[PDB]
């Protein structure tokens, strides 16, 4: 009972993020020569062209990491990441303009990916 002004006593336990959403692990490769860092809430299939991974597995998903954190890929680096399912309406607009609608248009998102040259459109 030394007083730290404004201090927290946090209750016991752990917080599970993105609970009850399906999760998926995939390998991803920074085939570029510059570092790439990916935010918690970008639609995974829409990330930097030069990331090689199976683009299909990115669709309707984002990184299963704490909100507001990011995964880093140094140039040349390959590593596994875990994904979770997008929620709400499961629609994506803007970003890279690959979806602009329901994440269910798998066939369309992937076609746009292939034509613009996102690596890993399988």
């Amino acid at each position: 009972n030394y007083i730290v002004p404004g201090e927290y006593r946090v209750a016991e336990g752990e917080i599970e993020i993105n609970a009850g959403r399906e999760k998926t692990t995939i390998r991803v490769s920074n085939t570029g020569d510059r570092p790439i860092q990916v935010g918690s809430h970008i639609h995974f299939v829409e990330v930097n062209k030069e990331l090689l991974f199976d683009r299909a597995e990115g669709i309707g998903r984002r990184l299963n990491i704490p909100s507001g954190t990011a995964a880093r890929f140094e140039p040349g680096e390959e590593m596994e990441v875990e994904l979770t399912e997008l929620g709400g309406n499961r629609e994506v607009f803007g970003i890279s303009d690959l979806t602009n609608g329901s994440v269910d248009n798998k066939e369309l998102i992937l076609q746009r990916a292939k034509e613009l040259g996102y690596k890993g459109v399988e």
Binding site: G6, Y8, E14, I15, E16, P66, G87
Partner: protein, 570 residues
């Protein structure tokens, strides 16, 4: 994946069950609930969540459910609860309390809390957010008092005065149509909400009533103008008709009557009893017995709050000096003795804790400190925890019950009393976006950011010439909310219905927001949130000892308080 609860609280502010110490007091508040979706929290910055296509919706125009402003991860402390939520603001008003972000991709988004292109972001993770404080005992004496008030998280000033004139120095009164007009015009440049009180004195109705029509928001009866049976009665008659509140400082001298006479004159009408303990004025020595009646809305002023070792010497001295009282003259000494009373000051601490006194207020610059209403509320709560212990009603080791009772005293209860709680006084949807962010270490001591009408008006912030905002010296400063014409849109002038109906704003060219005073005459003690106790209060004529339920209410003064020498440079 799971996040340990220490890291969680460190990144996002605390969640359900976490406790937080209020500054350096031994009061702890505990998160009762959390509106968030774990893993979908909102946050802003590089690689953060509020980015276009992600937690920020890129589709919707401002009208389509999008916010002007989102406060992310606020720990709200309010009469309505102590809990964790995003707060959404639009057009200067709180439109949503819940979970903000993008329904494209997030679960649980409150539907009118979309973060869109139009949306500004304030990070409140790790802050405590309260309603701005509402001080209903202000003397308009020195314009410098406004920043003093902002620095301690006060956002509404109700009271009266024309500046350092004797009448104003003694009473919260702006007398007569012309003075009220001049001050309404003055208010156009004060970056705080204001409501003005007319002189509650006269024996005909018209001289009083004309001040309500001129734009007063209420009246003050003060002994220095003659708190007689007549003035009390006419004022309440005016008030009942105009739907405004009346504040009273009664006849300390018992010249025209004793407390019971004042009550007969009041005759069951609604009235706000000022500095109810009596050090600040009133029927000697029993005024505080007012706080037991169902029709009295009881407030304390802050110099007596709480009962400390230096309290009595300071007050004895203040009074004697302030009244030009000589100590050779026995009537002066008898007067002082009958007025400054450890017996009632001690009890006032306890009546607060029992919810019998409903309200705090400052008495700024007449017998009280403009920037210390919030500060002294929490010092009182802390003293009481120390002396009386956890309230019967507490649970889980927190002070949430006591904290709600106390935060109510300077937020919702003054708003209800003044008939302005439709606009201000609490963090609730549909009310004006007067919000104060606190670092828990500075809680109740120095406000971090004061939001007025959805724009920051006041901030502790550093060197304006620096590369970032935090380099020294960090001091309180007016922000853009206060500059140019934005001062109009961020502040409310509260006025009587009749003056509004008569076009006083256009007559005078007021551009501030205009709020209606209303619903003051059909409330009572029972409407004071968390502080609704009525009871027979007996003050002993001989010994001045205060009984409630035939028990004497007494406590010790303390030699030391929290929220004091750890914080203050003088």
């Amino acid at each position: 994946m799971k996040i340990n609860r220490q890291q969680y609280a460190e990144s996002y502010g605390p969640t359900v069950g976490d406790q937080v110490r209020l500054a350096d007091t031994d009061l702890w508040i505990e998160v009762e609930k959390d509106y968030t979706t774990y893993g979908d929290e909102a946050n802003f910055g590089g690689g953060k969540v509020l980015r276009e296509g992600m937690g920020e919706n890129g589709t919707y125009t401002r009208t389509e459910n999008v916010l002007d402003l989102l406060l992310t991860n606020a720990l709200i402390l309010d009469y309505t609860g102590i809990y964790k939520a995003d707060i959404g603001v639009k057009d200067g008003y709180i439109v949503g309390i819940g979970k903000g972000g993008n329904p494209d991709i997030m679960d649980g988004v409150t539907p009118n809390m979309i973060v869109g292109t139009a949306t500004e972001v304030i990070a409140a993770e790790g802050k405590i957010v309260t309603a701005g404080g509402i001080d209903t005992h202000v003397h308009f004496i020195n314009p410098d008092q406004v920043d003093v008030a902002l620095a301690n998280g006060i956002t509404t000033l109700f009271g009266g005065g024309t500046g350092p004139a004797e009448g104003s120095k003694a009473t919260t009164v702006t007398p007569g149509p012309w003075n009220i007009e001049k001050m309404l015009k003055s208010t156009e440049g004060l970056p705080i909400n204001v409501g003005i009180l007319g002189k509650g004195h006269g024996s005909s109705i018209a001289p009083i009533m004309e001040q309500i029509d001129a734009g007063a928001a209420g009246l003050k009866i003060h002994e220095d103008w003659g708190a007689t049976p007549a003035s009390i009665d006419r004022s309440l008659t005016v008030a009942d008709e105009a739907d405004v509140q009346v504040a009273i400082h009664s006849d300390t001298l018992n010249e025209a009557g004793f407390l019971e006479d004042t009550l007969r004159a009041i005759n069951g009408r609604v009235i706000h009893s000022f500095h109810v303990e009596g050090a600040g004025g009133g029927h000697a020595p029993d005024i505080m017995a007012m706080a037991g009646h169902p029709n009295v809305l009881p407030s304390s002023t802050n110099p007596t709050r709480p009962f400390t070792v230096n309290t009595i010497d300071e007050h004895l001295d203040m009074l004697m000096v302030c009244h030009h009282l000589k100590q050779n003259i026995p009537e002066d000494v008898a007067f002082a003795d009958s007025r400054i009373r450890p017996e009632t000051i001690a009890a006032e601490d306890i009546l607060h804790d029992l919810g019998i006194i409903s309200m705090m207020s400052t008495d700024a610059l007449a017998m009280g400190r403009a920037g210390e209403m919030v500060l002294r509320t929490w010092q009182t709560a802390d003293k009481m925890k120390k002396q009386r212990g956890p309230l019967a009603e507490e649970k889980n080791g927190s002070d949430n019950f006591r904290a709600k009772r106390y935060v109510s005293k300077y937020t919702i209860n003054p708003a209800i009393a003044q008939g302005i709680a439709h606009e201000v006084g609490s963090i609730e949807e549909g009310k004006f976006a007067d919000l104060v962010l606190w670092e828990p270490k500075f809680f109740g001591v120095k406000a971090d950011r004061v939001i007025k009408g959805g724009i920051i008006a006041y901030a502790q912030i550093g060197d304006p010439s620096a590369s970032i905002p935090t380099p020294q010296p960090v001091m309180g400063r007016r922000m853009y909310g206060t500059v140019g014409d934005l001062i109009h849109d961020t502040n409310i002038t509260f006025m009587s219905k009749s003056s509004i109906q008569q076009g006083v704003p256009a007559k005078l060219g007021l551009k501030r927001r205009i709020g209606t005073v209303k619903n003051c005459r059909n409330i009572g003690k029972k409407d004071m949130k968390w502080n609704d106790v009525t009871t027979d209060i007996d003050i002993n004529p001989e010994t001045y000892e205060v009984k409630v339920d035939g028990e004497v209410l007494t406590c010790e003064p303390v030699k030391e308080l929290p929220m004091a020498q750890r914080y203050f440079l003088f």
